[PDB]
Design a protein around this ligand. Structure first.
Ligand SMILES: NS(=O)(=O)c1ccc(NC(=O)NCCCCO)cc1
Ligand SMILES: NS(=O)(=O)c1ccc(NC(=O)NCCCCO)cc1
Ligand SMILES: [Zn+2]
Length: 257
């Protein structure tokens, strides 16, 4: 099926997912000078105090930390959003080298990795219905650069040995996603898509200006994961990012000047 190799990578996805060539595909390059400041944008409201993480899963393309989304326990509101969006999972995209790995770029700059905190609009009842709607999801994207360690990431890093291969899951309770946030919640926003098949055009993207810094050892541990299942030939889970797609008829808005 689809993946990030030579024969199934992003340039091939359109053959099974023709929306790959659609009008609101993600990620994009964020040209910071042509983004328009919008004073009518509200600050983001991140309410993660009651978040309930449940488990961590290697799905063969990344690893997802999954949350209980059966109540308004961890929600995103405000910003460009109307209504309440519930956190369902977070995951990352990263590179084989510190010089690449992010999906969004900032004036063509690639970061070492990118965190996606995935939320769905509660007016649609569940994630499966939300992805069928143009305003169904809100993904908070946070860039990772290599520098000092991020202490709040370490519990993620340490469990990865237990989910090395595709299909492996592990209990992962009591993780606080607030430990992954930068100091500032200044953001860019634009309408886009899932960045993996099925590439559905259902996402309000909210990309934070301020990256978090993680240590070289932390991101090295991401690169020890496998795309393959256990007992299959080993292919390191690296470069699981889609490159920037045409902005087409879209304007990126900034919450800041
Ligand atoms: N459009 S897509 O989803 O990126 C895609 C690309 C390749 C394939 N299939 C494929 O490569 N099959 C042959 C695998 C031989 C490697 O052992 C399926 C889907
Ligand atoms: N990288 S991203 O744009 O934040 C993203 C988030 C969730 C998903 N989830 C997903 O595809 N789930 C499969 C079932 C719903 C799609 O029919 C995919 C990509
Ligand atoms: Zn993602």
């Amino acid at each position: 099926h689809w993946g990030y190799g030579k024969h199934n990578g992003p340039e091939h996805w359109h053959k099974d997912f023709p929306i790959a060539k659609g009008e609101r595909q993600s990620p994009v390059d964020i040209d910071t000078h042509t983004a328009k400041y919008d004073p009518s944008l509200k600050p983001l409201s991140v309410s993660y105090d009651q978040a309930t993480s449940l488990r961590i899963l290697n799905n063969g393309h990344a690893f997802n930390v999954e949350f209980d989304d059966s109540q308004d326990k961890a929600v995103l509101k405000g910003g460009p959003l109307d209504g309440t969006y519930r956190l369902i999972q977070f995951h990352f995209h990263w590179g084989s080298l510190d010089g690449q790995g992010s999906e969004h770029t900032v004036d063509k700059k690639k970061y070492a990795a990118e965190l996606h905190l995935v939320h769905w609009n509660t007016k649609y009842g569940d994630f499966g219905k939300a992805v069928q709607q143009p305003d169904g999801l809100a993904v908070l994207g946070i860039f990772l650069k290599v520098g000092s360690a991020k202490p709040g990431l370490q519990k993620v890093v340490d469990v990865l040995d237990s989910i090395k291969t595709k299909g492996k899951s592990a209990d992962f309770t009591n993780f606080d996603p607030r430990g992954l946030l930068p100091e500032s919640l200044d953001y860019w926003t634009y309408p886009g898509s899932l960045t993996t098949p099925p590439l559905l055009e259902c996402v309000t993207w909210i990309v934070l200006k301020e990256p978090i810094s993680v240590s070289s050892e932390q991101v090295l541990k991401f690169r020890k994961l496998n795309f393959n299942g256990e007992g299959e030939p080993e292919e390191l889970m690296v470069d699981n990012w889609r490159p920037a797609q045409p902005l087409k008829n879209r304007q990126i808005k900034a919450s800041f000047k």
